């Protein structure tokens, strides 16, 4: 009941302490069909060369950590053939399987929230100003929330209670989400379909969804337990499609 295995392409994930799997709105990923298509050229479907697990860089969960976020896509634009296909085409489409891992002993305590947010438009820490692209995303490196109000030009207002969006963070449960309670489980798994208002889109211009990881109960331990506790993310695209082949763009 607690064991799980997931296979995609030439990659496989096992786990012995999982809770369940969240299918975002009861909708599994799928390819675009004919009575919903607008673009006319025949699309390419690589199908094992792109649909497989890629692992990003880890972060260190310290006693005073506000939280982390990533933007998708553009966190996977340098990951093998998925990224190469992103560079050469005008239109792309894909769903995802996200898996978050964090293990600790039966003598530690803490609680993390793992949430996926579609169209997470963010605000600037200068009210009459605008954000730079660097402030929203550093590729495979995570951005970091703050515990107090922030200053600086072109940077995101990142105090963790407002989640960079002007809402109450305790309401983020309206989105697809799981929890990692250190006494209960050690991993979270979310399956996310393609969610947009058009059937396809350009993968450089538009961030489809943001992954947020926020500790609600801080990490705590006693006398001589282990101090280093990392968190790891692993994401696999699903049902990937591309249209509009031309010469490779450059940022």
């Amino acid at each position: 009941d607690r064991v799980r295995s997931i296979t995609l392409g030439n990659s496989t994930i096992t786990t012995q302490e999982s809770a369940n799997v969240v299918v975002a709105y009861g909708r599994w990923p799928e390819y675009l069909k004919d009575n919903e298509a607008t673009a006319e050229d025949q699309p390419t479907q690589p199908d094992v060369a792109t649909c497989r697990f890629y692992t990003l860089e880890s972060v260190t969960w310290e006693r005073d950590s506000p939280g982390w976020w990533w933007k998708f896509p553009d966190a996977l634009k340098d990951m093998g053939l998925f990224g190469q296909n992103m560079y050469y085409h005008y239109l792309g489409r894909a769903g995802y399987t996200i898996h978050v891992q964090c293990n600790a002993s039966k003598f530690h305590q803490g609680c993390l929230m793992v949430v996926c947010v579609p169209e997470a438009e963010m605000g600037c820490s200068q009210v009459d100003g605008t954000v730079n692209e660097h402030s929203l995303s550093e590729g495979e490196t995570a951005k970091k929330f703050a515990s107090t109000s922030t200053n600086g030009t072109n940077t995101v207002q990142s105090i963790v209670t407002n989640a960079g969006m002007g809402v109450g963070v305790g309401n983020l449960t309206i989105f697809p989400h799981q929890w990692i309670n250190l006494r209960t489980n050690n991993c979270a798994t979310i399956v996310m379909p393609y969610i947009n208002n058009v059937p396809m889109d350009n993968m450089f211009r538009h961030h489809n969804f943001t992954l947020m990881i926020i500790p609600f109960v801080p990490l705590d331990y006693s006398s001589d337990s282990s101090t280093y506790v990392p968190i790891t993310v692993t994401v696999a695209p699903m049902c990937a499609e591309y249209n509009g082949l031309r010469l490779a763009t450059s940022l």
């Binding site: 880890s58 891992q101 293990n103 003598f107 331990y221 001589d224 282990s226 101090t227 968190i231 692993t234």
Partner: protein, 59 residues
């Protein structure tokens, strides 16, 4: 006796999250590794092995 032409690649291991422990537990640990062959495996072209040898009889 593998060469550049018949190479097969490599294996590596990394920390995905990290090791977390409570107070009163050792902080260092070890992992072990076993190897075996699958049910599609076969060999051919018998030869003598280079791991055993002698200098004279009565050995």
């Amino acid at each position: 006796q593998q060469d550049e032409y018949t190479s097969a690649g490599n294996v590596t291991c990394w920390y995905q999250t990290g090791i977390v422990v409570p107070a009163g537990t050792p902080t260092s640990c070890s992992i072990m590794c076993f190897v075996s062959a699958c049910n599609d495996f076969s060999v051919r072209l018998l030869k003598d092995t280079p791991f055993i040898e002698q200098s004279a009889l009565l050995q």
